[PDB]
């Protein structure tokens, strides 16, 4: 059920939004932290 964006969740054209903590990288279509 839960398909939130974790440390590495495929995002882009046809995907869900990342969690409040994770975000979709501009270079790579994956949900991860904003920065180490």
**33 neighbors 8 (Cβ within 8 angstroms):** no
Tokens of 9: 């969740």
Tokens of 7: 């440390």
The coordinates were experimentally obtained by NMR
Tokens of 27: 């270079």
Best CA proximity match to 11, nearest among 25, 30, 27: 30
| Rounded Cα distance, 16 and 29, in Å | 11
| Rounded Cα distance, 13 and 36, in Å | 26
Three-class SS of residue 31?
strand
Task: Point out which residues pair with 5 in neighbouring strands.
Answer: 18
């Amino acid at each position: 059920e839960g398909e939130c964006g974790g440390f590495w969740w495929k995002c882009g054209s046809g995907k869900p939004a990342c969690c409040p903590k994770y975000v979709c990288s501009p270079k790579w279509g994956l949900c991860n932290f904003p920065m180490p």
